[PDB]
Ligand binder design. Structure first.
Ligand code: GTP
Ligand code: ZN
Ligand code: ZN
Length: 612
């Protein structure tokens, strides 16, 4: 019967590629049913402006060696084997009973005020025509070039409608996963560095349907701090410091921020079941559509991934399994956030003595009671002791027993990264040490007495990323506008870093004052892009850090950059600054040559001297 639910998708595939379809180089797959293969053409970039404005960093390996993705069949195969051909064991009965109660409570709290609703075509279109259906990677719309043209084409919507009737009928024909490649390991301190991950694509239509049925969780902000207490969905990275500093303001133990080692490979069928409880919030047609997404696309999956063969030849494998995620779903972040809140609530209950190692296998009735009673009595408060964004977590428990509350965690397969399995976690007394969404956060004193909580992250990573140009069809102009997007990002979020302040200015001096930044500087749901503008960045800085800063009680505007603070030198150096260095001194002193060489490549335009 699993065979039954993937039939139509396999069949559509054997048909379309009946030509080259064969069954089996001796395939690698261990935990995925293998159906067959066919021949395909395989699949498989420096920002001159940024490069030119950052000569010292030519000498830094973290920067020069940086690559984002590996789209080759080789990389597809490696990431699949290391992160997808894997199976997390299901938690024991006692643990299942605890997650059951815990997720019942969380669903009821998240739906206390908000009502589910279908998302719409015109809504999807609105989303597509802008700054993307980000992360939920689109790119299969190949009867059209782009998503913009596809959603404008009446025939596209007929495709959607047709599959929509199949779902309303209980079948999926087109909703198929394609593993495009691997996002490379990202940098970070032991226990926070992100491992490699899979990049999933689906037909644009399968994304619409998913978005129609379940997108409400994102569009109506179910995981906003206001709705969920623990979540931070909707906030920009510039808000997260402040939220952490508020959590730190509460009475309790040290602050914890344990990562799970490969969170997406560690979601269980139990977790999916508890997530699938959304269905019970929906009615009529809405629930029918959602039930199909959950059952036919989330649960009975079909996957295409490339593999190297024979004579510099590559095949596409077709495989299936009843599974869960890795992302590639419209609601991956929202459901990761949900499950992670649940996970942390269970950890807190162990830390607080409500449940023990004795309860893993079987949950005594008395304990079932104490669980429901604790959630009811405490859930609303404990949730505010958390900052949860996807698999990222920060939690401040009542006391440091939390450090040893590990039995339920490990039994849930939510094994922590880079620490021995039963070694107590490390917590920090100082909230400014705590890592969260690739940053930490520092409180700094501005010249005028007032203070701000700003985000800091390894500077090499930032320069490295700005140096990368995604283009092939990125212009001189597009290249300069991308460089400008990065520079202005740094001015809004990392102005407190000397080298970046200096490098943002020089980039901005070097690109026409009237060119609008384009492209994207971050994939993070927390990267809001107030820097995608031609508005003077001081004004934008004032708006973010003073005017709209709800932790800023005095609204007195900052008047010049010379009044906008830097971290202390010690910090700047800790996070990768090159100040106090011969090459960076030389660089600061010759900058103008680089700025001029850029103005002279781009040519005669309106420029502005921001180095004053
Ligand atoms: N578990 C999981 N997390 C993801 C996935 N995609 C993005 N993220 C999260 O998004 C956060 C931001 O980093 P990425 O999305 O990897 O890349 P990025 O955000 O463009 O890089 P930054 O500008 O440093 O934030 C990461 O810390 C991830 O935890 C995913 O598919 N699965
Ligand atoms: Zn389908
Ligand atoms: Zn720092």
């Amino acid at each position: 019967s699993n065979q039954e639910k993937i039939k139509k998708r396999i069949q559509k595939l054997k048909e379309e590629f009946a030509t080259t379809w064969h069954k089996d180089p001796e395939h690698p797959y261990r935990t995925w049913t293998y159906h067959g293969s066919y021949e395909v053409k395989a699949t498989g970039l420096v920002n001159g402006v940024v490069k030119l404005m950052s000569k010292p960093w030519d000498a830094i390996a973290n920067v020069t060696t940086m690559a984002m993705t590996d789209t080759t069949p080789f990389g597809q195969q490696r990431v699949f084997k290391e992160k997808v051909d894997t199976k997390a064991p299901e938690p024991p009965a006692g643990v299942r009973e605890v997650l059951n109660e815990t997720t019942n409570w969380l669903w009821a709290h998240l739906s206390r005020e908000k009502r589910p609703r279908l998302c719409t075509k015109e809504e999807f279109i609105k989303k597509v025509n802008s700054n993307a259906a980000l992360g939920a990677v689109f790119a299969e719309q190949n009867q059209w070039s782009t998503a913009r043209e596809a959603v404008n084409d009446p025939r596209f919507w007929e495709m959607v409608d047709e599959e929509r009737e199949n779902h309303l009928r209980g079948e999926c024909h087109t909703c198929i996963y394609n593993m495009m490649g691997k996002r490379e390991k990202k940098p970070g301190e032991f226990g926070k560095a992100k491992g490699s991950r899979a990049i999933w694509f689906m037909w644009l239509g399968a994304r619409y349907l998913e978005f129609e049925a379940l997108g409400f969780l994102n569009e109506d902000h179910w995981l906003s701090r206001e709705n969920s207490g623990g979540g931070v969905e909707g906030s920009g990275v510039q808000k997260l410091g402040y939220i952490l500093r508020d959590i730190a303001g509460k009475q309790g133990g040290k602050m914890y921020a344990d990562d799970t080692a490969g969170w997406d490979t560690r979601i269980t069928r139990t977790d999916l079941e508890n997530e699938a409880k959304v269905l019970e919030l929906l009615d009529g047609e809405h629930r029918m559509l959602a039930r199909a997404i959950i059952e036919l696309t989330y649960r009975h999956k079909v996957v295409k991934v490339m593999r190297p063969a024979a004579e510099g030849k590559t095949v596409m494998d077709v495989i299936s399994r009843e599974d869960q995620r890795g992302s590639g779903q419209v609601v991956t972040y929202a459901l990761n956030t949900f499950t992670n809140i649940a996970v942390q609530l269970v950890r807190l209950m162990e830390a607080e003595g409500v449940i023990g190692p004795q309860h893993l296998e079987q949950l005594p009735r008395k304990n079932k009671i104490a669980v429901r009673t604790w959630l009811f009595e405490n859930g609303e408060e404990r949730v505010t002791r958390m900052a949860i964004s996807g698999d990222d977590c920060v939690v401040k428990p009542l006391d440091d027993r939390f450090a040893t509350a590990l039995h339920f965690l490990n039994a849930m397969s939510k094994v922590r990264k880079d620490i021995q399995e039963w070694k107590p976690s490390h917590g920090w007394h100082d909230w400014q040490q705590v890592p969260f969404c690739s940053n930490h956060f520092q409180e700094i004193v501005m010249k005028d007495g007032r203070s701000i909580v700003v985000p800091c992250r390894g500077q090499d990573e930032l320069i490295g990323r700005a140096r990368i140009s995604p283009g092939a069809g990125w212009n001189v102009k597009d290249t300069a506008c991308l460089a400008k997007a990065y520079a202005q990002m740094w001015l809004l979020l990392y102005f407190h870093r000397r080298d970046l302040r200096l490098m943002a200015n020089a980039i901005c001096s070097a690109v026409p004052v009237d060119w609008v930044p384009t492209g994207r500087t971050s994939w993070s749901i927390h990267s809001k892009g107030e820097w995608m503008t031609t508005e003077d960045m001081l004004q934008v800085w004032n708006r973010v850090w003073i005017e709209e800063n709800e932790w800023m009680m005095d609204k007195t505007p900052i008047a010049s950059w010379t009044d906008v603070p830097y971290v202390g030198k010690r910090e700047d150096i800790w996070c990768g600054s090159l100040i106090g260095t011969r090459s960076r001194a030389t660089w600061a002193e010759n900058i103008y040559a680089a700025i001029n060489q850029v103005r002279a490549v781009i040519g005669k335009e309106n420029y502005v001297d921001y180095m004053t």
